[model samples]
Target: GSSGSSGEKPYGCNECGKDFSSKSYLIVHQRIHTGEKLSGPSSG
Candidate 1:
């Protein structure tokens, strides 16, 4: 979980400017943005 290393963003999204160190997170984030499914956290 070594993110934000050297103050550089190695993992970047081509569709969006969102930067992430782990590729796994990036994919999940994109799915959330696209409204493919509901968010993981609880909602009232």
Candidate 2:
């Protein structure tokens, strides 16, 4: 029973119920849940 076709989000996170604009963005956020932090260069 959903009504109206306006105001809808496509990419939604199942883990925390977050909405993203693109698939890549959603995947990056999912990594947080798994504790796989991205590493940075040690020496700048």
Candidate 3:
């Protein structure tokens, strides 16, 4: 059997139904719902 390549996203956001490649990314995306801010320079 060949190791098939597919767009598999295991980390998913329940609030938005968005998918991510890792759990860390999923948690960061969840901040949008909570209105949390990251400690860094503002892009805008």
Candidate 4:
């Protein structure tokens, strides 16, 4: 079940149209459009 109220868009990406709250959560959401999961930028 999707949490965070009714209209909650957790994550956001600039390069592409992507958003999600959790890692695995987004992974599942990606399946809808057959989009592949990508590793985020490294922060040091």
How many residue pairs collide in each prediction?
Answer: 0, 0, 0, 0
Cα lDDT of model 4 by residue, 1-44, tens digit = 86667756666544457877666767666667665456557532
lDDT of 1 by residue, 1-44 (tens): 66564754567777777888787888887875675455666654
Q: Could you tell me which residue pairs clash in candidate 1?
A: none
How high a TM-score does candidate 1 get? 0.43
Off by over 4 Å in 2: 1-8, 36-44
| True-vs-predicted CA distance for residue 24, candidate 3, Å | 0.7
Best-to-worst order by lDDT is: 3, 2, 1, 4
Q: For residues 1-44, write the lDDT of model 2, one tens digit per residue.
A: 66766554578899898998788899998888997446857543
Let me know the TM-score candidate 4 reaches against the reference structure.
0.35
Q: Lowest-scoring 10 consecutive residues by lDDT in candidate 1?
A: 35-44
Best by TM-score: 3
lDDT of each: 0.72, 0.80, 0.84, 0.63
Residue 43 of model 1, lDDT score:
50
Best by lDDT: 3
Runs off by more than 4 Å, candidate 3 = 1-7, 36-44
TM-score winner, 2 or 4? 2
